[PDB]
């Protein structure tokens, strides 16, 4: 009766996302997508400006 009561309150998500992140030190979801680098960026051809 208590395990289901924590899920409907959503406490377990706070109980989950605490220890997977506070023990981390790494950035999660850093990659995401590659659409923002679809074109040539500056630094890919910035040496021609140099």
């Amino acid at each position: 009766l208590a395990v289901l009561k924590l899920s409907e309150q959503g406490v377990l998500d706070k109980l989950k996302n605490k220890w997977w992140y506070d023990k981390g030190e790494c950035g999660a979801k850093d990659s995401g997508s590659k659409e923002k680098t679809s074109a040539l960026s500056l630094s890919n051809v910035a040496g021609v400006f140099y």
Partner: protein, 41 residues
């Protein structure tokens, strides 16, 4: 991360720090063209 980062009016006025330094700098050379023609004149 698919960012949405954008620039402010310190950057866009920094663009004016370039262009005004160009249109003034070409204006002084036209003096220097003149002020050494009336040196030779």
């Amino acid at each position: 991360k698919k960012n949405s980062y954008s620039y402010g009016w310190s950057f866009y006025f920094g663009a004016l720090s370039f262009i005004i330094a160009e249109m003034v700098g070409v204006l002084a050379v036209h003096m220097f063209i003149d002020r050494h023609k009336q040196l030779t004149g």
